[PDB]
Ligand binder design. Structure first.
Ligand SMILES: CCCCCCCCCCCCCCCCCC(=O)OC[C@H](COP(=O)([O-])OCC(O)COP(=O)([O-])OC[C@@H](COC(=O)CCCCCCCCCCCCCCCCC)OC(=O)CCCCCCCCCCCCCCCCC)OC(=O)CCCCCCCCCCCCCCCCC
Ligand code: BCL
Ligand code: BCL
Ligand SMILES: CC[C@H]1c2cc3[nH]c4c(c3C)C(=O)[C@H](C(=O)OC)c4c3nc(cc4[nH]c(cc(n2)[C@@H]1C)c(C(C)=O)c4C)[C@@H](C)[C@@H]3CCC(=O)OC/C=C(\C)CCC[C@H](C)CCC[C@H](C)CCCC(C)C
Ligand SMILES: CC[C@H]1c2cc3[nH]c4c(c3C)C(=O)[C@H](C(=O)OC)c4c3nc(cc4[nH]c(cc(n2)[C@@H]1C)c(C(C)=O)c4C)[C@@H](C)[C@@H]3CCC(=O)OC/C=C(\C)CCC[C@H](C)CCC[C@H](C)CCCC(C)C
Ligand SMILES: COC1=C(OC)C(=O)C(C/C=C(\C)CC/C=C(\C)CC/C=C(\C)CC/C=C(\C)CC/C=C(\C)CC/C=C(\C)CC/C=C(\C)CC/C=C(\C)CC/C=C(\C)CCC=C(C)C)=C(C)C1=O
Ligand SMILES: COC1=C(OC)C(=O)C(C/C=C(\C)CC/C=C(\C)CC/C=C(\C)CC/C=C(\C)CC/C=C(\C)CC/C=C(\C)CC/C=C(\C)CC/C=C(\C)CC/C=C(\C)CCC=C(C)C)=C(C)C1=O
Ligand SMILES: COC(C)(C)C(=O)C/C=C(\C)CC/C=C(\C)CC/C=C(\C)CCCC/C(C)=C/CCC(C)CC/C=C(\C)CCC=C(C)C
Ligand SMILES: CCCCCCCCCCCC[N+](C)(C)[O-]
Ligand SMILES: CCCCCCCCCCCC[N+](C)(C)[O-]
Ligand SMILES: CCCCCCCCCCCC[N+](C)(C)[O-]
Ligand SMILES: CCCCCCCCCCCC
Ligand SMILES: CCCCCCCCCCCC
Ligand SMILES: CCCCCCCCCCCC
Ligand SMILES: CCCCCCCCCCCC
Ligand SMILES: CCCCCCCCCCCC
Ligand SMILES: [Fe+3]
Lengths: 240, 281, 300
């Protein structure tokens, strides 16, 4: 009976498909490791796939995965227990050390480029023809932290040019330097921008950018990591 | 064992209940208080199902069926063999789903991410509880709920639907379907788009998101954008479930006749009800 | 703040797109900008590409639509009040079983169905061609076209392949809102309840699974959008904390996880298999299996 054959064949196909897909999703993070960074004994029943190589645009090289995995950064954490599977306590300040929910990855220290090789993200003042088109314009608003203290003022919006979206607010602090705040971690209100994740004293600690008109993937990761980390780690001063 | 990048995120904190007490992992799995709750509710539920199997008399996965109390029982309790087990298993199932959600919330707090996933999952839970709790209660009996069996629950889908004629005519159900179909369309498109850019023709460099936007603009004259498409998929999938739950909550309560006949309100509007011709005059 | 709607919109010069090997002569100017759309996605409408295949597709598509509507107007006695009142009840029906696979049926009793179906056939396949060709002109993979083909498969099976193998056009789906739902119901009754078709049950698992998948995936990307997680192609090329936190959410929750590229492979297949399994289920119904309940009692 043909329908019997089709359904039997389909389950065989489906099992192969699942095998293939699970192996495709092992191109990052594998082999598994013990808590000391060493290869773990039990990798499970799925082997690593043949490497593939992505050819990056604008002469930025290639990526080949799977390949040798490295954090490429120190990780300021230590064991809290004598056996596997417990948490790892921060050894200094986790916001500054970039661990836990303040983690960042060692992404390339270049800016993301659009399809034409120009920087993807730019402060709006450097992006010709870009302006606020709808909604409350936050430029000029005081920025308030979770301690209800004013941390600074918004001096620009950093925009994704090809997507035409707001990605950060550039906030100037009391000392005259600025920080980027991810747009997803601010609340624009009629008379202020409110920032839940950070108390006013934690703004200076936001990682800074090298060139004041661009931001690199490494810098984005450090900034976003750090403000996200405030949700757990600004326990000395948070209220509604 | 840990993924190569994992250790840095396995710090203390994030728990909603128990402080540091259940703040650990088993292999890949985070535990937490709500992991202990999930194990308890799920293990008891499974044990009671395996027991209900014996009181039926059978070990085949595609025969085991746990039926709710008969309609006679109303909303009261029922002896274990005649619906009571279904009632307990249902409480266990709800406990396990809510516990799983709340364990998801703890994992979000530890990872510093948004709560969108458990929020989304709560829609699936609300649909489940529509079928086993809210709808039955509004209708006066546990017996309007579906039985827990692989084939027996489809029997219930089929009898429940044909009670109101062809269930296609339920307008909340039309909207729900439309969302499910649209979601699959969107998931196909999105997957394909990302992969077509990351995996271009043989020579070539990885395409950029601008190429992806350009593809869709060339094809349909519009690109929703990388944030937009994830917003859309979330909205389409949650809307399908919301309207699923809506279409059943209204059925047997507010509307209990043949769903086809509902449409008569339109054809009977006074400005065209009595005009000769067409299908209805 | 949840990132479902944007708080502030920005606009700049219209993005006219990447060029690559596209013929720019065939690309329109940019449409207008919608602030409404812009709360949710991008504000820019157009440009669109309309070469010869696109004009052909748009034209047969409209001809399909107008053929059905001219028939609906007829059925309404040319009266607009009746047309609106009865809109969901009208139906352009295929030829009766008597006419087999022939084109000899009168316009008023099947021939118009064939004309509208011809136009639809040309519209969909030329649009498929366009799906492939636009990717090609940009140097992109053909995943869109392969995916679209899965949908076309179910469509083909319903209106073309299955009628051909059953010996008559009478067996195809009518063009009407209510009538096609009646056809669907009736198809199941006549084949012994489609819930016993194992391919229908797979189709459902995939349909539900796609809602599962996109709810999971959309929610995951929005949850890590505070680290730029929606920039997926760059997270593929150079993994960030967004991708790591995403993976790890799921690893800790259910014991395994995806990559930023691989989740799109899970995705495309979850969706494509809806209509793959679906078309098989339908194709086998009446050709090889007359009653799925019966077939289920035997597996044979
Ligand atoms: C009858 C029904 C007819 C219906 C027709 C509708 C068909 C719809 C097809 C669905 C397309 C979605 C998939 C898109 C995709 O990823 O492939 C792009 C792929 C290439 O795209 P491209 O743009 O030309 O290349 C760009 C990149 O260079 C390369 O691009 P890339 O690297 O991104 O994509 C690589 C792709 C490349 O794919 C291929 O080259 C073809 C290989 C497929 C083999 C299929 C076997 C068929 C089995 C029959 C089952 C019958 C069921 C009943 O890899 C795969 O997808 C592999 C799938 C794994 C299936 C494994 C099954 C093994 C069974 C045995 C297991 C035993 C278990 C024991 C228990 O397109 C295809 O080759 C068609 C896929 C056919 C699959 C079947
Ligand atoms: C003959 C039958 C009638 C009919 C009668 C009904 C009836 C009756 C119902 C539907 C319902 C639905 N029908 Mg209908 N329907 C018909 C024809 C159709 C057709 C079609 C092409 O013809 C389609 C596409 C649909 C589509 C749909 C959906 C809109 C909706 C189902 C999804 C849902 O509710 O998910 C919601 C999701 C869930 C309930 C799942 C929840 C999962 C929980 C939270 C988690 C479980 C975890 C699990 C136990 C874990 C296992 C552990 C392992 C490790 C994994 N119907 C015919 C005409 N339809 C249903 C509905 O709307 O329900 C609300 C419903 O009750
Ligand atoms: C009483 C009715 C029967 C029944 C009868 C049928 C029949 C008959 C069929 C299904 C099919 C399906 N059913 Mg069933 N179904 C029932 C009960 C259910 C229930 C339920 C909870 O009870 C559910 C969840 C489902 C679910 C499903 C889906 C999994 C599947 C459709 C997939 C899809 O995406 O199709 C939708 C997608 C398409 C049709 C693809 C279309 C692609 C084309 C190319 C698009 C052209 C567009 C056109 C040109 C318009 C242009 C628009 C403009 C551009 C704007 N059924 C009951 C038992 N069901 C289908 C299937 O595959 O079954 C195996 C099918 O044929
Ligand atoms: C709301 C949009 C869609 C959605 C979303 C969604 N589902 C989700 C999530 C989200 C966002 C998760 O985060 C969560 C997850 O972890 O996924 C991997 C989940 C999940 N969705 C799941 C399944 C699922 N979702 C479905 C549907 C959908 N989920 C929607 C279409 C369906 C359908 C359509 O039928 C199913 C079967 C699980 C894989 C997972 C939740 C796992 C969970 O809660 O685990 C804890 C509980 C257990 C391990 C076992 C409990 C055992 C019980 C005590 C006994 C069994 C009782 C049961 C009622 C018997 C039923 C028998 C059947 C034959 C009827
Ligand atoms: C894998 C399974 C899922 C899937 C996938 C899928 N569908 C797809 C694709 C893919 C991968 C495409 O690439 C293709 C696409 O282009 O998507 C945007 C498509 C597509 N899926 C479509 C529809 C569709 N898909 C469906 C389903 C599904 N598609 C599944 C759930 C359904 C259902 C659920 O029934 C429908 C109705 C189309 C939107 C699009 C294919 C378009 C096509 O073939 O068009 C031919 C031309 C016409 C129809 C034009 C006629 C016009 C209208 C009838 C009315 C008026 C509008 C007009 C365009 C205005 C013009 C103005 C003039 C003045 C110039
Ligand atoms: C890498 O990134 C990506 C991008 O960016 C670079 C992209 O651009 C895109 C491209 C994406 C797009 C351009 C968007 C695609 C859009 C869709 C798939 C469709 C969206 C459409 C909707 C929002 C509508 C959905 C809802 C529907 C259809 C329900 C309504 C339908 C009916 C006919 C219901 C009828 C009800 C009745 C009969 C009566 C009820 C009456 C009562 C009174 C109740 C992708 C994929 C991407 O991946
Ligand atoms: C881009 O980003 C993203 C990722 O990362 C990069 C991701 O990974 C994912 C996740 C997606 C995938 C990995 C794709 C595959 C997903 C599906 C097809 C969905 C269906 C999933 C399943 C069928 C698996 C179900 C697993 C469950 C419910 C758990 C089963 C667990 C056990 C067997 C053990 C039981 C555990 C219990 C009872 C208790 C809890 C723990 C204690 C020890 C106590 C998404 C969405 C994503 O968008
Ligand atoms: C306002 O009025 C005007 C006149 C302006 C209008 O234009 C109004 C128009 C309408 C009111 C239009 C209404 C349209 C509908 C309600 C359409 C309904 C459509 C469906 C629900 C369709 C469902 C399914 C269709 C399927 C499965 C079709 C499949 C078709 C094919 C696979 C094509 C097969 C080809 C054939 C049979 C011919 C092949 C012949 C050769 C020689 C190759
Ligand atoms: C519907 C079922 C699809 C899910 C397939 C599940 C397979 C996941 C197992 C992965 C093992 C993880 N390890 C051990 C590689 O980390
Ligand atoms: C992308 C892979 C996802 C795999 C999900 C498969 C779930 C199987 C559901 C059982 C269907 C049973 N049927 C209908 C064959 O009896
Ligand atoms: C009752 C049938 C359900 C089939 C789905 C089971 C898939 C669970 C995969 C979990 C893998 C986790 N592990 C063991 C790798 O950690
Ligand atoms: C989900 C399990 C179904 C497996 C059926 C295998 C038949 C060969
Ligand atoms: C849900 C997983 C399906 C796995 C199918 C295995 C059957 C092989 C015969
Ligand atoms: C939970 C289902 C897992 C099914 C995966 C089985 C993979 C079979 C190996 C086939 C070798 C090509
Ligand atoms: C959890 C599923 C294990 C299947 C592995 C089979 C590989 C051969
Ligand atoms: C989970 C459902 C099992 C049914 C599989 C039937 C195999 C043919
Ligand atoms: Fe995505």
């Amino acid at each position: 009976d043909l329908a019997s054959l089709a359904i039997y064949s389909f389950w065989i196909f489906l099992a192969g498909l699942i095998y293939y897909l699970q192996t495709e999703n092992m191109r990052e993070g594998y082999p598994l490791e013990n808590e000391d960074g060493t290869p773990a004994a039990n990798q499970g029943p799925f082997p690593l796939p043949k490497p593939k190589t992505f050819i990056l645009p604008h002469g930025r090289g290639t990526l080949t995965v799977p390949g040798p995995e490295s954090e490429d950064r120190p990780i300021a954490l230590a064991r809290t227990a004598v056996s596997e599977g417990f948490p790892h306590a921060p050894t200094g300040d986790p916001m500054k050390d970039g661990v836990g929910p303040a983690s960042w990855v060692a992404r390339r220290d270049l800016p993301e480029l659009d399809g034409h090789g120009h920087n993807k993200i730019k402060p709006m003042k450097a992006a010709a023809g870009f302006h606020v088109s709808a909604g409350k314009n936050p430029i000029g608003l005081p920025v308030r932290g979770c301690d209800l203290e004013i941390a600074g003022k918004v001096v620009d919006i950093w925009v994704d040019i090809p997507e035409q979206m707001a990605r950060f607010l550039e906030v100037e602090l009391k000392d005259g330097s600025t920080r980027l705040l991810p747009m997803q971690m601010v609340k624009v209100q009629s008379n202020r921008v409110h920032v839940n994740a950070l108390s006013s004293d934690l703004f200076a600690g936001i990682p800074t950018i090298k060139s004041p008109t661009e931001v690199t993937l490494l810098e984005e990761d450090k900034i976003c990591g750090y403000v996200a980390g405030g949700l757990m780690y600004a326990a000395p001063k948070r209220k509604s | 064992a840990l993924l190569s990048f994992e250790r840095k995120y396995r710090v203390p904190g994030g728990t909603l209940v128990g402080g540091n007490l259940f703040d650990f992992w088993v292999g890949p799995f985070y535990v937490g208080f709500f992991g202990v709750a999930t194990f308890f509710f799920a293990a008891l539920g499974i044990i009671l199902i395996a027991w209900s199997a014996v009181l039926q008399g059978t070990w085949n996965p595609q025969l085991i069926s746990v039926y709710p109390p008969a309609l006679e029982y109303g909303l009261g309790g029922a002896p274990l063999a005649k619906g009571g087990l279904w009632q307990i298993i249902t409480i266990c199932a709800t406990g396990a789903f809510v516990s799983w959600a709340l364990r998801e919330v703890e994992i979000c707090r530890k990872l510093g991410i948004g709560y969108h996933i458990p929020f989304a999952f709560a829609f699936a839970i609300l649909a489940y509880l529509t079928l086993v709790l809210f709808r039955p209660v509004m209708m006066g009996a546990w017996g309007y709920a579906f039985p827990y069996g692989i084939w027996t629950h489809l029997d219930w889908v089929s009898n429940t639907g044909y009670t109101y004629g062809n269930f296609h005519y339920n307008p909340a159900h039309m909207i729900a379907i439309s969302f499910f179909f649209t979601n699959a369309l969107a998931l196909a498109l999105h997957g394909a788009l990302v992969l077509s850019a990351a995996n271009p023709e043989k020579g070539k460099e990885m395409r950029t998101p601008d190429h992806a936007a350009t593809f869709f603009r060339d094809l349909v004259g519009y690109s929703i954008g990388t944030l937009g498409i994830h917003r859309l998929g979330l909205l389409l999938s949650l809307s399908a479930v919301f309207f699923s739950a809506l279409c059943m909550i209204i059925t047997g309560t507010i509307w209990f006749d043949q769903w086809v006949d509902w449409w008569q309100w339109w054809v009977k509007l006074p400005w065209w009800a009595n005009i000769p011709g067409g299908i209805n005059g | 703040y949840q990132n479902i709607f944007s708080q502030v919109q920005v606009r700049g010069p219209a993005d006219l797109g990447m060029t690559e090997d596209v013929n720019l002569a065939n690309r329109s100017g940019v449409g207008p900008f919608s602030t409404l759309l812009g709360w949710f996605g991008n504000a820019q409408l157009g440009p669109i590409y309309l070469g010869s295949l696109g004009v052909l597709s748009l034209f047969s598509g409209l001809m399909w639509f107008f053929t059905i509507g001219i028939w609906f107007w007829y059925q309404a006695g040319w009266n607009p009040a009746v047309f609106l009142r009865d809109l969901f009840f009208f139906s352009l029906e295929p030829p009766a079983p008597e006419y087999g696979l022939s084109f000899a049926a009168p316009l008023k009793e099947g021939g118009l169905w064939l004309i509208a179906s011809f136009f639809m056939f040309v519209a969909v396949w030329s649009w498929w061609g366009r799906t492939y060709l636009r990717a090609q002109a940009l140097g992109m993979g053909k995943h869109t076209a392969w995916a679209f083909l899965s949908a076309i498969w179910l469509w083909m099976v319903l209106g073309f392949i299955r009628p051909i193998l059953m010996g008559s056009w009478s067996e195809a789906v009518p063009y009407g809102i209510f009538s096609h739902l009646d056809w669907t119901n009736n198809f199941s009754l006549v084949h012994g309840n489609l819930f016993y078709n194992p391919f229908h049950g797979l189709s459902i698992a995939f349909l539900y699974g796609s809602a599962l998948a996109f709810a999971m995936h959309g929610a995951t990307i929005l949850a890590v959008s505070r680290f730029g997680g929606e920039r997926e192609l760059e997270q593929i090329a150079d993994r960030g904390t967004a991708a790591e936190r995403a993976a790890l959410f799921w690893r800790w929750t259910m014991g395994f996880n995806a990559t930023m590229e691989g989740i799109h492979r899970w995705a495309i297949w979850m969706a494509v298999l809806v209509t793959l399994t679906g078309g098989i289920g339908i194709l086998l119904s009446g050709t090889v299996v007359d009653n799925w309940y019966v077939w289920g009692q035997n597996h044979g």
